[PDB]
Structure formats: structure tokens, C-alpha cells
């Protein structure tokens, strides 16, 4: 909605990563790649890294 604060927006995508990680781990049969997770989310490997940080705090 534009004023998505970035905090909320980034944090939400962060969770989606946790989920996408175990999904691809099963789908691939080993730890997934930042890139693979990036692709699974329709996002860039850099945005994955950025979003991840928001989820830890």
C-alpha cells in the first residue's frame, strides 16, 4: 500500500524465506541456495539477504 513502512514489508518477506528454505530443501534433497530461494520467491539473492536480516531482529 505504499506506506508499507518497509519494516513490516521486509519482515513479511523474511518469513516467506524461512518457509521457502525448507520447501526447497525437501524439493531438492539438500540445503537450498540463496539463488534457488531467490528464484522460488521471485526476488533477487540480494533482496533475500536484506529481508533475512529483518527477520532475525
Amino acid at each position: 500500500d505504499g506506506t508499507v513502512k518497509v519494516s513490516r514489508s521486509l519482515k513479511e518477506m523474511g518469513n516467506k524465506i524461512r518457509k521457502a528454505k525448507d520447501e526447497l530443501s525437501k524439493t531438492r534433497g539438500r540445503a537450498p541456495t540463496v539463488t534457488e530461494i531467490a528464484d522460488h520467491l521471485g526476488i533477487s539473492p540480494e533482496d533475500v539477504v536484506l529481508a533475512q536480516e529483518a527477520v532475525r531482529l
Partner: protein
């Protein structure tokens, strides 16, 4: 507050994402809207790509230099390159103008910069390099 950052990296197509994410992460301290952080993030990509594909004509040894200064609701972005330089600034800034037409070049670019940022200033000298300013005042409610 007065927070400042300085980044440099090989002029490689690949460092465009890296660059915007970094700037974003930093300008994030201002707690901007996902909307604002996107514009900022777009402008950085437009300027770094321009530096890479024009300033250094894709030469990896290029080294793009970025500089951001956060100081009271304002973002101070600076993209610099010791590259080729811009023959004519005014011409390069008019919409749809490009030097690499035959290379699927979004005529836009400086036009994108001008729209998303509050101020865009260009300083360039042939065979010296280019420096784009870019200032964004982030909203507070």
C-alpha cells in the same frame, strides 16, 4: 543525525543489485516507506548501470564509487566514476536519448532519476569521469 557510508566496487553488471541493496539497507535507518526505499533503490540501479555500461564501457576494472549521507530526513546519494565522461550533459538528460540505441537502451534513465529523486545534479568531464548527485527528502508524519 549525521551518518555516512562510502562504497566502491568493480564495474561489473552483477554489482547493480548489490549496490541498491546496500544503499537500501543504509537508507533504511530512516525508516522510509517501502515506496520511497524502492525509488531510492531504482535510482541507484539506474546510476550504477549507467556508470558501468557507459562510464567504463563495461570494463570490469572500472570501479564505481558510491557515497551516501543520511542527515535529518534527507538522503545524499552520489555515484561517481573515473570513466569516459559525458560529452553533453543537457543532451544526455533529455528523455529517450542514448548513445547505445542499437543496444536495447531504455531511452529513459536520467528521466527516471529526475522523477524519483528530489534533486539530480550531474558533473562530468570527457575522459575524466562522471558524478551524479541525487537527493531524497524522506517523509515523517
Amino acid at each position: 543525525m549525521r551518518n555516512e557510508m562510502h562504497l566502491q566496487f568493480s564495474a561489473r553488471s552483477e554489482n547493480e543489485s548489490f549496490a541498491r541493496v546496500t544503499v537500501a539497507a543504509f537508507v533504511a535507518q530512516l525508516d522510509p516507506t517501502m515506496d520511497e526505499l524502492t525509488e531510492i533503490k531504482t535510482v541507484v540501479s539506474e546510476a550504477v548501470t549507467n556508470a558501468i555500461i557507459h562510464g567504463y564501457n563495461n570494463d570490469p576494472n572500472g570501479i564505481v564509487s558510491i557515497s551516501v549521507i543520511i542527515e535529518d530526513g534527507v538522503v545524499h546519494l552520489t555515484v561517481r566514476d573515473e570513466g569516459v565522461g559525458i560529452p553533453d550533459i543537457e543532451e544526455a538528460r533529455q528523455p529517450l536519448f542514448t548513445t547505445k540505441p542499437e543496444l536495447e537502451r531504455s531511452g529513459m534513465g536520467f528521466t527516471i532519476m529526475e522523477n524519483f529523486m528530489d534533486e539530480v545534479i550531474v558533473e562530468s568531464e570527457v575522459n575524466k569521469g562522471t558524478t551524479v548527485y541525487l537527493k531524497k527528502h524522506i517523509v515523517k508524519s
